[PDB]
């Protein structure tokens, strides 16, 4: 119950947030942009995943 | 009347205050509900069951 709420709030999206439509060189700097305070947890973004 | 009484006190009308985290010092997104609930201690104590 708690963990599906944490995931459903995490992997979602909104039509404008901090860092809308910026491009990221990996998931590591995705978490670094979430922690430093430069993007939001749900902000649509092109990443490069492997 | 709950909203009007929350306006007599200087509290926010929604009943919800933004709360920071004691671990990380940074704000919880999406403001949370804080209030006073009258909580009771029932006589099912754990060092009568262990």
């Amino acid at each position: 119950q708690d963990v599906v709420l944490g995931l459903y709030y995490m992997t979602r999206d909104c039509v404008n947030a901090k860092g809308e439509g910026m491009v990221l060189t990996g998931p590591k700097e995705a978490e670094r942009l979430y922690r430093s305070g430069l993007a939001s947890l749900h902000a649509r973004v092109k990443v490069r995943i492997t | 009347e709950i909203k009007e009484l929350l306006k007599l006190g200087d509290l926010p009308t929604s009943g919800q205050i933004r709360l920071y985290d004691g671990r990380t010092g940074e704000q919880f997104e999406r403001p949370v509900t804080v209030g006073y609930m009258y909580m009771l201690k029932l006589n099912h104590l754990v060092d009568d069951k262990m």
Binding site: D2, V3 | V46, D47, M50
Partner: protein
């Protein structure tokens, strides 16, 4: 008396020794499962949430 040396003895008898946790209305076989203990300051069994 519970002296200062039996807690190291206890952490050396726990280590790789599973226990059977059991909730009281056991209906199917997933209601008896074996764990490894991790010792708790307290008086309550801490049980992993997914389980």
């Amino acid at each position: 008396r519970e002296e200062a040396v039996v807690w190291d003895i206890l952490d050396e008898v726990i280590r790789e020794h599973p226990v059977l946790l059991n909730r009281a209305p056991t209906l199917h076989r997933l209601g008896i499962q074996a764990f490894e203990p991790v010792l708790i300051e307290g008086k309550a069994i801490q049980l992993h949430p997914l389980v």
